[PDB]
Amino acid sequence: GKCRGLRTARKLRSHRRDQKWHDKQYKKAHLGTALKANPFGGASHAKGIVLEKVGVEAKQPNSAIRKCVRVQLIKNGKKITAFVPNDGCLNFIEENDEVLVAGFGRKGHAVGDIPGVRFKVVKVANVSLLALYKGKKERPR
Amino acid sequence: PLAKDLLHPSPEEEKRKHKKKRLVQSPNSYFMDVKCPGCYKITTVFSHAQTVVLCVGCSTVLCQPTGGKARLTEGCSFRRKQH
Amino acid sequence: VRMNVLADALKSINNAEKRGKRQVLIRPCSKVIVRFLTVMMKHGYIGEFEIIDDHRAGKIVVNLTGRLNKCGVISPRFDVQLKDLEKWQNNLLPSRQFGFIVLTTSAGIMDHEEARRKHTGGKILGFFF
Amino acid sequence: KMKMQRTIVIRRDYLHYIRKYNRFEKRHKNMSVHLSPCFRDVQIGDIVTVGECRPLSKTVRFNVLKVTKAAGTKKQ
Amino acid sequence: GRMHAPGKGLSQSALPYRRSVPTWLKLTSDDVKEQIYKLAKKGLTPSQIGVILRDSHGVAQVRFVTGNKILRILKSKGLAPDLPEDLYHLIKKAVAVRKHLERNRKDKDAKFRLILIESRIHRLARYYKTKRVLPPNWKYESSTASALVA
RNA sequence: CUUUAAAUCCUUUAACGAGGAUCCAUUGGAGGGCAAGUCUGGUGCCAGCAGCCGCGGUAAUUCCAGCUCCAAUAGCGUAUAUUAAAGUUGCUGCAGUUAAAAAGCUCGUAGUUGGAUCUUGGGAGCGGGCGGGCGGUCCGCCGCGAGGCGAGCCACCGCCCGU
RNA sequence: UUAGAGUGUUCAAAGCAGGCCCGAGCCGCCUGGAUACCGCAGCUAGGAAUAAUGGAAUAGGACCGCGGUUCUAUUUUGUUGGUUUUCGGAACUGAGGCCAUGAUUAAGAGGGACGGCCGGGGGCAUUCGUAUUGCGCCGCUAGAGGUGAAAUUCUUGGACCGGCGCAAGACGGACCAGAGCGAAAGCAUUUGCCAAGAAUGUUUUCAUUAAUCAAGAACGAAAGUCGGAGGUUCGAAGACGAUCAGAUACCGUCGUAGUUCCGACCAUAAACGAUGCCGACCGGCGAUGCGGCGGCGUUAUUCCCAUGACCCGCCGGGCAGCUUCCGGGAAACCAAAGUCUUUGGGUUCCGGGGGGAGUAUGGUUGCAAAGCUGAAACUUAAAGGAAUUGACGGAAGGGCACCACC
């Protein structure tokens, strides 16, 4: 059930150079089409303005209306949905605001009740969203 | 524990194995003589013949090869295993 | 067919030791196999054996003893550069305290402890413990 | 090969060792070498000993010094 | 097991351990060496020559009583066949089947067995060609082959 | 004063310089994994929390806060790339009847692997050396210079055991 | 830089620095800053077990032997200067020699021959058996088919039934089995013919010729396609009659393609043992097929004898079976799915959570149907295997109850 020979080092090698492609944890990270469809250019964060403010429901077991934002990036000009993670911190978000967006916490997947949103908002017009909540900073009006 | 000698088995267990599976292999055939019915020129003949033999002393067939052992037409003196 | 005629003999005794027999016969013979079993017998792992002779090959009978636990073979015949020997006897042996691995060598076939004193290496054959 | 005049093409087998596995991997690299035009009776498939030289041509560097196989061949 | 039809068959002969003259009928090598020629001249492959010496004359083995086996004897005198005795017959079966194959076309069994047999022959050619028994420029054709054989 | 082209900081001696908010310690948690509240007020499948399992419809151990405790401590959470975990890329080291999985079967060139066999045997040989019962000894006791023992500093010898 | 030795940078991270001895009287001393590691490839030299590889088979090693041609000089009277010899060597060449004169064995590897068989193995011809449908003739009658019940259907133009024949196309029942062969798909009427094959039996031959297998090639049930001939039965599509609320379904009467045959395409099936090939080993037992062997009686013959048929056993190779805690496994199960942390006999293909998908596109084969090769975006927390308890069954086996029936 193996090669195991002593002049076979090439076949053990051109087999594993072939069967690595079926490890989806490796096919994604080593094929140019996986990163291309990423709205980020592989970056950690990406700035971009806010072009509306919309809410999205939750999955079947538990009901709610998660609040979100329709952020358009400036890097690629794409359009993505960004969750606004905080308690009632949709009062500081406004149209044409240039918010900073980060990965949601599952390396390119949804999390929990939120359907189809993989992005959360960390800053809002160059002030930290945590700072606005706890009050340390203040967004000038 | 089924601990039995594979070196010194009975001369009668050795016939309970194939021609090849014995201690030291040896053929199951035996070279035999035949007295050539009607004459006294005694010829050799191999027990597991695969060919007929015809006797000038008989002008009739002597051994008939059938299966994997010979059958002799008429009885004769049969020495054996002088080898 | 038969390729590693050392491997088949060792599996023939290993399967016969597991059952609990006292004697076992192996079908082919060789200096490689005779000089092998002598290494075991020089440690007392087995009893005292006989080597039936023919014109064809020879067939060894061994008087097994209840002292060896497993008698493996390792193929392909690798190399042991005497810096890998300490790796081998730690991922292929039960412990350092006992058990030996036999590796062929420019000075005959000998278990690894012999190799250290004679300060040499060479290809590897198998192991027991 | 006993192709283009005054030079021959020689295969050269050898083993390359892969580090990851403890196993070898056969390769080969075949190169052109000049010849001594003294020679008919240089068959193919036979060993030869070759020496280095100044760059005789675009791909002719090594040159032939003495051929080494006639016994394993036909009539005396 | 076999090489083309499955089954670990086992019916081979078994030489005795004793390597001596029979000592019931010597008829020493002078007779046998000059005797084999009569059978080989009369026309019998080295495969069948052993039978008649064994079955009626009485010989343990030609390799025992004489010096060398039945081909090395026939090699020196000049009575070695044109083609090796195993190859010659393999062509016969390859030729007779092809003869039957050109008539009973839909006989799919023959059209298969012919593929095995041409594979057996081409395997023996690539072995003999190394051992110089057959010339390098030899080639089995399946058309020019029946003219080599009766 | 010292440092150094020139100053800068550490280092050395000055004059001051701590009573609880003076000289005020954080970043994340308290359902499980995973250390720590079946504590109080609010909210009522709302707000929201939650990497995952999940909490929220009147007694919320999970939300928002207060108090008490827990983790790391001038550091600590978040995002993504990456390694170990991974015996889930497996040469050491995976699996293939049913859990994804063996070409319908055979032939077969490259490629990989390939039966057995050329002292698998000794000498009171000769001698050197480790430990070892030994016969001997310079040697150590013992003795009356008529004598008794061989191992224990020093080892020596002909010899055996130890692969 | 990794490791590491020496050293009190106040410690350490670091750094290759530093320690004495005295006011200084020496017109200074002692030192440091090393070592290992650094594959693969190249060079060198000891070792020669294992693994490649070599040598005299239609003559080759050995003996300073005695012979020829052809030449290259060293230096002796000619110091140098031209000429002849011998020796030494080199090239090809004449007789016999000393070789113990050169060929390991023949594998529970393989090819091949040989002998008596064996098999629903393959092809071609030949032959038979009933059955079905159709028809001719004769008989008697009013119903015949068909379903759960009927109706379309069949007859006043004599159906179904009964008898004697004629024609056609399919198919081989009963024998027929956990029995046989084939690589697999698969194969069952008597006879003949052509060629092949496993297994046994062998004191025959060759002497490693062999295992596995990318690319490639032959065969590949059913269905389907292309042309010719035939079309009995069955019968996708189709038209009807039924049941149903609907029933373009199951059910019933018709019926095209098709089914069978010869010549080519197609290359797919739960083509299944859902279980690669070759090789070795580890338990018993009663049987089955073929071959050979040993057997005491019987039966076919008047005679062991040739030989069958029975009856007792052995051996090899098969299809398979029962049992066991050898041992595996998630377990159902397994003499392989065992010899697996105590892992390594050799080799081929292939899987990495489920879905999108065997989809799109690209290449390629195909007359067409389609086959081979074959992604990603996105989505999802579970898909999935074996057993255990219940529940449930328009699932069978027992049994009870007027909240059940007769």
PDB file of C-alpha atoms in Angstrom, chain C:
ATOM      1  CA  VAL C   1       7.107 -13.562  -5.603  1.00  0.00           C
ATOM      2  CA  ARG C   2       9.797 -13.449  -2.889  1.00  0.00           C
ATOM      3  CA  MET C   3      11.938 -10.296  -2.718  1.00  0.00           C
ATOM      4  CA  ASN C   4      13.362  -9.648   0.765  1.00  0.00           C
ATOM      5  CA  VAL C   5      14.217 -13.208   1.773  1.00  0.00           C
ATOM      6  CA  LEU C   6      15.286 -11.923   5.177  1.00  0.00           C
ATOM      7  CA  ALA C   7      11.846 -10.415   5.757  1.00  0.00           C
ATOM      8  CA  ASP C   8       9.874 -13.598   5.110  1.00  0.00           C
ATOM      9  CA  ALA C   9      11.979 -15.708   7.471  1.00  0.00           C
ATOM     10  CA  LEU C  10      11.581 -13.264  10.360  1.00  0.00           C
ATOM     11  CA  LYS C  11       7.816 -13.056   9.882  1.00  0.00           C
ATOM     12  CA  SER C  12       7.776 -16.859   9.822  1.00  0.00           C
ATOM     13  CA  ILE C  13       9.292 -17.093  13.294  1.00  0.00           C
ATOM     14  CA  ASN C  14       7.441 -14.051  14.627  1.00  0.00           C
ATOM     15  CA  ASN C  15       4.082 -15.578  13.699  1.00  0.00           C
ATOM     16  CA  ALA C  16       5.233 -18.907  15.137  1.00  0.00           C
ATOM     17  CA  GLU C  17       6.461 -17.377  18.390  1.00  0.00           C
ATOM     18  CA  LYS C  18       3.146 -15.587  18.933  1.00  0.00           C
ATOM     19  CA  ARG C  19       1.290 -18.898  18.882  1.00  0.00           C
ATOM     20  CA  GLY C  20       3.684 -20.520  21.349  1.00  0.00           C
ATOM     21  CA  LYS C  21       5.437 -23.267  19.383  1.00  0.00           C
ATOM     22  CA  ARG C  22       8.862 -24.554  20.386  1.00  0.00           C
ATOM     23  CA  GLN C  23      10.334 -25.159  16.916  1.00  0.00           C
ATOM     24  CA  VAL C  24       9.811 -23.418  13.581  1.00  0.00           C
ATOM     25  CA  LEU C  25      11.166 -23.958  10.069  1.00  0.00           C
ATOM     26  CA  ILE C  26      11.956 -21.239   7.516  1.00  0.00           C
ATOM     27  CA  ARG C  27      11.908 -22.016   3.824  1.00  0.00           C
ATOM     28  CA  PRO C  28      14.955 -20.270   2.285  1.00  0.00           C
ATOM     29  CA  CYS C  29      18.427 -19.888   3.758  1.00  0.00           C
ATOM     30  CA  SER C  30      21.329 -17.516   3.379  1.00  0.00           C
ATOM     31  CA  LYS C  31      24.486 -16.346   5.056  1.00  0.00           C
ATOM     32  CA  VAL C  32      22.506 -13.140   5.575  1.00  0.00           C
ATOM     33  CA  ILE C  33      19.922 -15.159   7.499  1.00  0.00           C
ATOM     34  CA  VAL C  34      22.354 -17.552   9.186  1.00  0.00           C
ATOM     35  CA  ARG C  35      24.603 -14.689  10.294  1.00  0.00           C
ATOM     36  CA  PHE C  36      21.374 -13.047  11.445  1.00  0.00           C
ATOM     37  CA  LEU C  37      20.062 -15.739  13.790  1.00  0.00           C
ATOM     38  CA  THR C  38      23.560 -16.182  15.216  1.00  0.00           C
ATOM     39  CA  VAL C  39      23.319 -12.604  16.495  1.00  0.00           C
ATOM     40  CA  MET C  40      20.200 -13.562  18.443  1.00  0.00           C
ATOM     41  CA  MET C  41      21.731 -16.823  19.671  1.00  0.00           C
ATOM     42  CA  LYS C  42      24.804 -14.913  20.826  1.00  0.00           C
ATOM     43  CA  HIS C  43      22.468 -12.964  23.152  1.00  0.00           C
ATOM     44  CA  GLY C  44      20.379 -15.943  24.272  1.00  0.00           C
ATOM     45  CA  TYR C  45      17.171 -14.699  22.652  1.00  0.00           C
ATOM     46  CA  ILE C  46      16.644 -18.097  21.003  1.00  0.00           C
ATOM     47  CA  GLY C  47      17.616 -21.714  21.554  1.00  0.00           C
ATOM     48  CA  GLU C  48      19.949 -23.747  19.344  1.00  0.00           C
ATOM     49  CA  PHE C  49      19.116 -24.266  15.690  1.00  0.00           C
ATOM     50  CA  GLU C  50      19.956 -26.560  12.783  1.00  0.00           C
ATOM     51  CA  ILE C  51      20.476 -25.833   9.087  1.00  0.00           C
ATOM     52  CA  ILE C  52      19.110 -28.524   6.774  1.00  0.00           C
ATOM     53  CA  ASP C  53      21.172 -28.740   3.588  1.00  0.00           C
ATOM     54  CA  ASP C  54      20.119 -29.647   0.052  1.00  0.00           C
ATOM     55  CA  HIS C  55      21.387 -28.929  -3.403  1.00  0.00           C
ATOM     56  CA  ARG C  56      18.565 -26.424  -3.912  1.00  0.00           C
ATOM     57  CA  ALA C  57      18.610 -23.884  -1.085  1.00  0.00           C
ATOM     58  CA  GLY C  58      18.683 -25.187   2.472  1.00  0.00           C
ATOM     59  CA  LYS C  59      15.927 -24.805   5.066  1.00  0.00           C
ATOM     60  CA  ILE C  60      16.693 -23.694   8.632  1.00  0.00           C
ATOM     61  CA  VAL C  61      14.891 -25.139  11.630  1.00  0.00           C
ATOM     62  CA  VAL C  62      15.083 -23.038  14.794  1.00  0.00           C
ATOM     63  CA  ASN C  63      14.515 -24.180  18.368  1.00  0.00           C
ATOM     64  CA  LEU C  64      12.577 -21.155  19.562  1.00  0.00           C
ATOM     65  CA  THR C  65      12.627 -20.063  23.191  1.00  0.00           C
ATOM     66  CA  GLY C  66      10.203 -17.925  25.146  1.00  0.00           C
ATOM     67  CA  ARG C  67      12.503 -14.928  25.492  1.00  0.00           C
ATOM     68  CA  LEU C  68      12.048 -12.708  22.418  1.00  0.00           C
ATOM     69  CA  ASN C  69       9.019 -10.446  22.175  1.00  0.00           C
ATOM     70  CA  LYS C  70       9.087  -9.326  18.539  1.00  0.00           C
ATOM     71  CA  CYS C  71      11.550  -9.880  15.680  1.00  0.00           C
ATOM     72  CA  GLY C  72      10.981  -7.250  13.018  1.00  0.00           C
ATOM     73  CA  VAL C  73      12.585  -6.476   9.675  1.00  0.00           C
ATOM     74  CA  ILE C  74      13.274  -2.992   8.321  1.00  0.00           C
ATOM     75  CA  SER C  75      13.299  -2.420   4.561  1.00  0.00           C
ATOM     76  CA  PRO C  76      14.574  -0.810   2.363  1.00  0.00           C
ATOM     77  CA  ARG C  77      18.121  -1.334   3.627  1.00  0.00           C
ATOM     78  CA  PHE C  78      18.865   2.183   4.851  1.00  0.00           C
ATOM     79  CA  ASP C  79      22.105   3.776   6.019  1.00  0.00           C
ATOM     80  CA  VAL C  80      23.254   4.651   9.528  1.00  0.00           C
ATOM     81  CA  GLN C  81      25.846   7.430   9.602  1.00  0.00           C
ATOM     82  CA  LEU C  82      26.478   6.860  13.334  1.00  0.00           C
ATOM     83  CA  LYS C  83      24.887  10.244  13.968  1.00  0.00           C
ATOM     84  CA  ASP C  84      21.439   8.888  13.064  1.00  0.00           C
ATOM     85  CA  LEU C  85      21.976   5.731  15.121  1.00  0.00           C
ATOM     86  CA  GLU C  86      20.723   7.423  18.286  1.00  0.00           C
ATOM     87  CA  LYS C  87      17.602   8.544  16.448  1.00  0.00           C
ATOM     88  CA  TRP C  88      16.923   5.016  15.181  1.00  0.00           C
ATOM     89  CA  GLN C  89      17.266   3.267  18.525  1.00  0.00           C
ATOM     90  CA  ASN C  90      14.810   5.776  20.041  1.00  0.00           C
ATOM     91  CA  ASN C  91      12.010   5.600  17.452  1.00  0.00           C
ATOM     92  CA  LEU C  92      12.349   1.864  16.767  1.00  0.00           C
ATOM     93  CA  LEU C  93      13.108   0.257  20.151  1.00  0.00           C
ATOM     94  CA  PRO C  94      11.276  -0.256  23.445  1.00  0.00           C
ATOM     95  CA  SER C  95      13.985   1.384  25.556  1.00  0.00           C
ATOM     96  CA  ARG C  96      17.683   2.069  25.854  1.00  0.00           C
ATOM     97  CA  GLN C  97      18.089  -0.464  28.667  1.00  0.00           C
ATOM     98  CA  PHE C  98      17.491  -3.511  26.454  1.00  0.00           C
ATOM     99  CA  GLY C  99      16.775  -4.601  22.912  1.00  0.00           C
ATOM    100  CA  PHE C 100      19.293  -4.343  20.076  1.00  0.00           C
ATOM    101  CA  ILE C 101      19.148  -3.430  16.393  1.00  0.00           C
ATOM    102  CA  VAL C 102      21.299  -5.295  13.881  1.00  0.00           C
ATOM    103  CA  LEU C 103      22.924  -3.447  10.985  1.00  0.00           C
ATOM    104  CA  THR C 104      25.241  -4.848   8.333  1.00  0.00           C
ATOM    105  CA  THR C 105      28.716  -3.390   8.231  1.00  0.00           C
ATOM    106  CA  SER C 106      32.054  -3.507   6.418  1.00  0.00           C
ATOM    107  CA  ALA C 107      33.177  -5.732   9.315  1.00  0.00           C
ATOM    108  CA  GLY C 108      30.338  -8.241   9.095  1.00  0.00           C
ATOM    109  CA  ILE C 109      26.795  -8.301  10.415  1.00  0.00           C
ATOM    110  CA  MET C 110      26.561  -7.161  14.027  1.00  0.00           C
ATOM    111  CA  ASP C 111      24.139  -5.538  16.432  1.00  0.00           C
ATOM    112  CA  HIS C 112      24.386  -1.812  16.990  1.00  0.00           C
ATOM    113  CA  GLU C 113      26.325  -1.988  20.263  1.00  0.00           C
ATOM    114  CA  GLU C 114      29.112  -3.689  18.322  1.00  0.00           C
ATOM    115  CA  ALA C 115      28.983  -0.823  15.822  1.00  0.00           C
ATOM    116  CA  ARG C 116      29.678   1.790  18.486  1.00  0.00           C
ATOM    117  CA  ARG C 117      32.855   0.065  19.690  1.00  0.00           C
ATOM    118  CA  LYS C 118      34.154  -0.658  16.199  1.00  0.00           C
ATOM    119  CA  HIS C 119      33.149   2.946  15.553  1.00  0.00           C
ATOM    120  CA  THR C 120      31.590   2.294  12.138  1.00  0.00           C
ATOM    121  CA  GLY C 121      28.255   2.263  10.335  1.00  0.00           C
ATOM    122  CA  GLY C 122      26.712   0.787   7.199  1.00  0.00           C
ATOM    123  CA  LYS C 123      23.334  -0.420   6.056  1.00  0.00           C
ATOM    124  CA  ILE C 124      20.663  -1.596   8.487  1.00  0.00           C
ATOM    125  CA  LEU C 125      18.914  -4.975   8.549  1.00  0.00           C
ATOM    126  CA  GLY C 126      16.292  -5.267  11.271  1.00  0.00           C
ATOM    127  CA  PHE C 127      15.745  -5.401  15.011  1.00  0.00           C
ATOM    128  CA  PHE C 128      14.550  -7.485  17.935  1.00  0.00           C
ATOM    129  CA  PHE C 129      13.665  -6.933  21.573  1.00  0.00           C
TER     130      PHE C 129
END
